[PDB]
Design a protein around this motif. Structure first.
Motif, PDB file in Angstrom:
ATOM      1  N   UNK A   1     136.070 -68.623 -40.071  1.00 31.61           N
ATOM      2  CA  UNK A   1     137.485 -68.315 -39.843  1.00 31.61           C
ATOM      3  C   UNK A   1     138.366 -69.388 -40.491  1.00 31.61           C
ATOM      4  N   UNK A   2     138.038 -70.645 -40.188  1.00 34.09           N
ATOM      5  CA  UNK A   2     138.806 -71.790 -40.654  1.00 34.09           C
ATOM      6  C   UNK A   2     138.873 -71.782 -42.183  1.00 34.09           C
ATOM      7  N   UNK A   3     137.727 -71.577 -42.854  1.00 33.50           N
ATOM      8  CA  UNK A   3     137.690 -71.565 -44.309  1.00 33.50           C
ATOM      9  C   UNK A   3     138.675 -70.548 -44.854  1.00 33.50           C
ATOM     10  N   UNK A   4     138.748 -69.365 -44.249  1.00 32.30           N
ATOM     11  CA  UNK A   4     139.601 -68.304 -44.764  1.00 32.30           C
ATOM     12  C   UNK A   4     141.059 -68.513 -44.336  1.00 32.30           C
ATOM     13  N   UNK A   5     141.255 -68.884 -43.064  1.00 36.54           N
ATOM     14  CA  UNK A   5     142.602 -69.125 -42.547  1.00 36.54           C
ATOM     15  C   UNK A   5     143.278 -70.286 -43.280  1.00 36.54           C
TER      16      UNK A   5
ATOM     17  N   UNK B   1     143.020 -81.948 -43.520  1.00 37.82           N
ATOM     18  CA  UNK B   1     141.795 -82.281 -42.783  1.00 37.82           C
ATOM     19  C   UNK B   1     141.673 -81.626 -41.414  1.00 37.82           C
ATOM     20  N   UNK B   2     142.755 -81.631 -40.635  1.00 38.00           N
ATOM     21  CA  UNK B   2     142.724 -81.094 -39.296  1.00 38.00           C
ATOM     22  C   UNK B   2     143.872 -80.096 -39.146  1.00 38.00           C
TER      23      UNK B   2
ATOM     24  N   UNK C   1     149.770 -73.111 -18.961  1.00 37.26           N
ATOM     25  CA  UNK C   1     148.507 -72.407 -18.974  1.00 37.26           C
ATOM     26  C   UNK C   1     147.682 -72.958 -20.126  1.00 37.26           C
ATOM     27  N   UNK C   2     146.360 -72.839 -20.001  1.00 39.66           N
ATOM     28  CA  UNK C   2     145.496 -72.906 -21.184  1.00 39.66           C
ATOM     29  C   UNK C   2     145.771 -71.707 -22.074  1.00 39.66           C
ATOM     30  N   UNK C   3     145.582 -71.949 -23.385  1.00 36.94           N
ATOM     31  CA  UNK C   3     145.712 -70.930 -24.403  1.00 36.94           C
ATOM     32  C   UNK C   3     144.461 -70.871 -25.289  1.00 36.94           C
ATOM     33  N   UNK C   4     144.202 -69.684 -25.812  1.00 42.07           N
ATOM     34  CA  UNK C   4     143.158 -69.455 -26.794  1.00 42.07           C
ATOM     35  C   UNK C   4     143.501 -70.131 -28.131  1.00 42.07           C
ATOM     36  N   UNK C   5     142.724 -71.144 -28.516  1.00 41.45           N
ATOM     37  CA  UNK C   5     143.002 -71.846 -29.770  1.00 41.45           C
ATOM     38  C   UNK C   5     141.735 -71.951 -30.637  1.00 41.45           C
ATOM     39  N   UNK C   6     141.935 -72.218 -31.937  1.00 41.23           N
ATOM     40  CA  UNK C   6     140.850 -72.580 -32.845  1.00 41.23           C
ATOM     41  C   UNK C   6     141.139 -73.921 -33.517  1.00 41.23           C
ATOM     42  N   UNK C   7     140.229 -74.877 -33.322  1.00 40.47           N
ATOM     43  CA  UNK C   7     140.349 -76.198 -33.922  1.00 40.47           C
ATOM     44  C   UNK C   7     139.605 -76.146 -35.245  1.00 40.47           C
ATOM     45  N   UNK C   8     140.335 -76.343 -36.353  1.00 39.07           N
ATOM     46  CA  UNK C   8     139.719 -76.425 -37.662  1.00 39.07           C
ATOM     47  C   UNK C   8     139.653 -77.891 -38.094  1.00 39.07           C
ATOM     48  N   UNK C   9     138.469 -78.352 -38.503  1.00 39.53           N
ATOM     49  CA  UNK C   9     138.338 -79.721 -38.955  1.00 39.53           C
ATOM     50  C   UNK C   9     137.386 -79.757 -40.144  1.00 39.53           C
ATOM     51  N   UNK C  10     137.839 -80.408 -41.215  1.00 38.30           N
ATOM     52  CA  UNK C  10     137.108 -80.466 -42.470  1.00 38.30           C
ATOM     53  C   UNK C  10     135.756 -81.160 -42.238  1.00 38.30           C
ATOM     54  N   UNK C  11     134.742 -80.729 -42.992  1.00 37.61           N
ATOM     55  CA  UNK C  11     133.386 -81.221 -42.838  1.00 37.61           C
ATOM     56  C   UNK C  11     133.328 -82.589 -43.486  1.00 37.61           C
ATOM     57  N   UNK C  12     132.297 -83.347 -43.130  1.00 35.83           N
ATOM     58  CA  UNK C  12     132.062 -84.649 -43.735  1.00 35.83           C
ATOM     59  C   UNK C  12     131.767 -84.569 -45.231  1.00 35.83           C
TER      60      UNK C  12
ATOM     61  N   UNK D   1     135.337 -76.313 -43.672  1.00 34.08           N
ATOM     62  CA  UNK D   1     135.804 -76.593 -42.320  1.00 34.08           C
ATOM     63  C   UNK D   1     134.771 -76.091 -41.326  1.00 34.08           C
ATOM     64  N   UNK D   2     134.682 -76.720 -40.151  1.00 32.01           N
ATOM     65  CA  UNK D   2     134.044 -76.056 -39.026  1.00 32.01           C
ATOM     66  C   UNK D   2     135.119 -75.505 -38.090  1.00 32.01           C
ATOM     67  N   UNK D   3     134.794 -74.360 -37.512  1.00 31.65           N
ATOM     68  CA  UNK D   3     135.636 -73.619 -36.604  1.00 31.65           C
ATOM     69  C   UNK D   3     135.138 -73.932 -35.198  1.00 31.65           C
ATOM     70  N   UNK D   4     136.033 -74.381 -34.294  1.00 33.91           N
ATOM     71  CA  UNK D   4     135.707 -74.523 -32.877  1.00 33.91           C
ATOM     72  C   UNK D   4     136.707 -73.755 -32.012  1.00 33.91           C
ATOM     73  N   UNK D   5     136.255 -72.633 -31.440  1.00 34.27           N
ATOM     74  CA  UNK D   5     137.051 -71.843 -30.512  1.00 34.27           C
ATOM     75  C   UNK D   5     137.160 -72.618 -29.202  1.00 34.27           C
TER      76      UNK D   5
END
Length: 124
Positions: free
Chosen positions: A25-29, A42-43, A77-88, A97-101
């Motif tokens: 997801x992150x790569x495309x988004x 990066x983030x 409230x908590x919200x539905x998020x995606x953390x995108x962070x570039x790979x090493x 990127x790795x995608x973390x829901x």
């Protein structure tokens, strides 16, 4: 220029989906929101709630921003998020990127009229 509100929407809003499904997801988004254009941003975090619910954070829990301004707000409230962070190993122009829901509260800086988010400060 792009307004600050518009930039926030480009960089941080994905109301299309309730979560990240495919783990690229992150790569495309990141590519479609122009965040790998000149360099690899990066983030970056994406919020998967309605724009109305996100803008509403501007009338929730007032907190300091990281920069020390006091126009930041934390979602009740908590919200539905995606953390995108570039790979090493990621290197421009092949940004990886790795995608973390996750479900977390967001903190955004709000400004202007209408009083809407202009900066993603953090998730907690």
């Amino acid at each position: 220029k792009e307004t600050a509100a518009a930039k926030f929407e480009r960089q941080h809003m994905d109301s299309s989906t309730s979560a990240a499904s495919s783990s690229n997801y992150c790569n495309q988004m990141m590519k479609s929101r122009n965040l790998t254009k000149d360099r690899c941003k990066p983030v970056n975090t994406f919020v998967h709630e309605s724009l109305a619910d996100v803008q509403a954070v501007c009338s929730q829990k007032n907190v300091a921003c990281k920069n020390g301004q006091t126009n930041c707000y934390q979602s009740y409230s908590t919200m539905s998020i995606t953390d995108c962070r570039e790979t090493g190993s990621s290197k421009y122009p092949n940004c990886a990127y790795k995608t973390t829901q996750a479900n977390k509260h967001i903190i955004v800086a709000c400004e202007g009229n209408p009083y809407v988010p202009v900066h993603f400060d953090a998730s907690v």
